[PDB]
Amino acid sequence: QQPLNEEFRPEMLQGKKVIVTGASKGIGREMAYHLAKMGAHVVVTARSKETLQKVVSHCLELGAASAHYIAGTMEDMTFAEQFVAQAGKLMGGLDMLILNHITNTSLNLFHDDIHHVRKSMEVNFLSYVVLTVAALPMLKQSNGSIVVVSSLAGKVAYPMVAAYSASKFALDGFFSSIRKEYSVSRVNVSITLCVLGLIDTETAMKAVSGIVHMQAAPKEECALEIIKGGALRQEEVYYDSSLWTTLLIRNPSRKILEFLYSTSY
Amino acid sequence: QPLNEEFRPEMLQGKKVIVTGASKGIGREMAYHLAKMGAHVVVTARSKETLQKVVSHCLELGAASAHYIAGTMEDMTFAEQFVAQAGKLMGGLDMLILNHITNTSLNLFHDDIHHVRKSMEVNFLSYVVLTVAALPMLKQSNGSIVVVSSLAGKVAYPMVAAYSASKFALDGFFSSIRKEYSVSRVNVSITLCVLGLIDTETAMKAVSIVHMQAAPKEECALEIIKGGALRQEEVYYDSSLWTTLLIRNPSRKILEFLYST
Ligand SMILES: NC(=O)c1ccc[n+]([C@@H]2O[C@H](COP(=O)([O-])OP(=O)(O)OC[C@H]3O[C@@H](n4cnc5c(N)ncnc54)[C@H](OP(=O)(O)O)[C@@H]3O)[C@@H](O)[C@H]2O)c1
Numbered sequence: 001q002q003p004l005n006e007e008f009r010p011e012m013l014q015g016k017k018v019i020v021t022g023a024s025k026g027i028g029r030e031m032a033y034h035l036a037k038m039g040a041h042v043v044v045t046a047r048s049k050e051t052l053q054k055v056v057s058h059c060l061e062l063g064a065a066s067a068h069y070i071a072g073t074m075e076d077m078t079f080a081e082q083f084v085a086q087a088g089k090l091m092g093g094l095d096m097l098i099l100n101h102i103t104n105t106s107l108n109l110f111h112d113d114i115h116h117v118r119k120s121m122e123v124n125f126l127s128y129v130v131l132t133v134a135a136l137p138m139l140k141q142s143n144g145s146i147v148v149v150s151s152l153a154g155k156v157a158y159p160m161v162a163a164y165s166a167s168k169f170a171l172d173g174f175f176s177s178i179r180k181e182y183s184v185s186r187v188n189v190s191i192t193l194c195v196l197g198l199i200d201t202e203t204a205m206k207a208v209s210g211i212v213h214m215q216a217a218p219k220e221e222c223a224l225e226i227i228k229g230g231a232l233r234q235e236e237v238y239y240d241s242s243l244w245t246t247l248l249i250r251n252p253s254r255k256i257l258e259f260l261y262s263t264s265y
Numbered sequence: 266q267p268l269n270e271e272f273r274p275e276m277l278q279g280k281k282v283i284v285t286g287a288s289k290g291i292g293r294e295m296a297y298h299l300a301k302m303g304a305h306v307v308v309t310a311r312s313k314e315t316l317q318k319v320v321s322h323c324l325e326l327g328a329a330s331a332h333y334i335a336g337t338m339e340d341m342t343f344a345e346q347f348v349a350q351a352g353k354l355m356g357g358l359d360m361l362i363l364n365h366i367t368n369t370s371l372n373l374f375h376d377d378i379h380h381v382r383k384s385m386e387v388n389f390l391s392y393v394v395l396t397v398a399a400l401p402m403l404k405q406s407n408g409s410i411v412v413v414s415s416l417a418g419k420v421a422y423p424m425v426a427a428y429s430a431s432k433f434a435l436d437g438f439f440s441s442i443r444k445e446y447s448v449s450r451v452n453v454s455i456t457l458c459v460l461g462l463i464d465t466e467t468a469m470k471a472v473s474i475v476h477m478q479a480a481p482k483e484e485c486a487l488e489i490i491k492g493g494a495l496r497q498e499e500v501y502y503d504s505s506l507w508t509t510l511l512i513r514n515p516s517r518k519i520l521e522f523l524y525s526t
Pocket residue numbers: 021022023024025026027028045046047048049051072073074075100101102103104123149150151152196197198199200201202203204
């Protein structure tokens with residue numbers, strides 16, 4: 001996967017057609033906003049019809065070539081599959097598929113909550129694969145891009161986020177594998193996996209409350225960096241408050257081994 | 266907290282051990298090694314016929330006891346009840362070896378979604394259900410959980426998308442609760458094993474699409490048991506020394522240490 005060899009410019013997204021999931025609040029909403037500003041066509045999804053509307057309202061006043069919302073729950077794969085189809089039609093195609101939604105989760109020890117483990121895998125991982133399968137044909141059409149939003153909990157181990165973390169790891173294994181598959185079948189669709197540290201979204205802040213005192217990067221800048229990375233067709237993006245974090249969490253060896261086994265066969 | 270000493274067979278003598286996916290390949294070799302050590306063993310798989318053969322040989326090898334319960338790990342009710350049944354039979358549980366995986370061959374992903382869901386149910390979810398079910402007994406014995414994984418469960422390759430997803434899931438979930446146990450002072454060890462190619466009949470058929478050296482299943486099984494007995498966090502086992510040394514990711518353990526204090 002060849003990343004683009006040039007600085008990012010806002011106009012790279014002008015007239016592009018972008019789906020953003022989990023776009024009712026937090027990072028997703030900010031991403032939708034940023035795309036508005038850049039004159040993108042946008043389709044946002046989430047369960048809350050009401051919050052979804054307010055988002056769309058603002059995306060239009062910000063200069064969005066066109067903005068729609070479609071409400072529904074990614075718990076339901078039939079919905080997920082139909083959503084992409086409806087969004088495809090609402091826009092006349094697709095250039096970027098931003099997968100951002102996660103199931104409601106908070107900080108607990110794993111007290112055998114098997115149900116929350118399964119829901120996490122359905123919502124946080126399985127629906128992404130479904131959404132992807134649905135979007136590929138269109139993405140092949142426009143030589144487009146997939147952006148998978150993930151976390152530090154999706155690269156290293158933390159306590160209190162076992163199911164969540166299981167799901168984010170799943171995304172890495174799966175999407176990094178298909179990235180190789182696309183390379184060798186030469187499909188020109190790029191996959192960008194985003195690894196995020198603490199972000200000051202409402203949900204996160206309430207969840208870590210008093211349980212851990214640590215700096216949180218701004219959601220606005222965070223959302224912009226997810227887009228840029230997706231736009232320059234980078235394989236991975238890293239965003240945290242600390243540079244210590246964002247430089248250290250990258251795994252240099254794994255990338256070397258992978259390449260070393262590609263030349264071998 | 267592992268054990269600074271070397272491993273000896275007698276660390277297993279009379280230990281009550283479950284082994285899943287033990288009707289063939291590495292799973293079968295583990296039951297075999299355990300039996301040689303005088304452990305109490307309960308094995309499982311779908312096929313009762315072959316399970317019957319494993320059990321018979323375990324008794325031949327010196328197994329303290331050797332029984333089988335057949336079912337499908339696609340069924341989480343079975344998984345749950347399997348653990349309870351096995352523990353009641355043996356009188357408790359020392360070591361849960363989780364080894365089974367849904368049937369897998371080498372394919373490009375092809376909207377193949379049913380295979381992704383099943384791989385996650387069988388390769389991953391069922392491990393969480395068996396762990397939940399075994400945990401009370403393991404606490405009683407200060408026992409250990411051994412999770413079998415793969416290179417593809419640590420790095421990325423083509424042809425094993427669903428498979429990797431599930432193995433990556435295993436590392437994320439289990440490493441996370443290992444830290445949870447660490448801070449709740451629950452002394453049950455968790456051992457993740459990272460295996461490269463092993464000459465298991467089933468693996469040799471899925472590839473042989475690619476030629477590469479394969480480590481012996483019999484040895485692989487022992488290394489997996491060793492690491493569990495010793496309560497090591499991770500076990501690495503490939504034929505090539507370059508892999509078993511390069512697949513390691515030291516920065517990650519450094520980071521996890523620095524973000525815990
Ligand atoms: N914030 C952080 O500190 C942080 C850190 C690391 C990684 N990340 C990653 O960044 C992404 C967004 O995080 P965030 O903090 O911005 O999240 P958030 O504020 O809690 O927003 C989550 C979004 O997902 C939607 N959603 C929840 N359940 C859904 C369901 N069942 N079906 C469809 N949509 C659903 C929500 O809308 P509805 O309620 O209307 O459904 C909401 O728009 C996540 O992937 C997360 O892993 C965030």
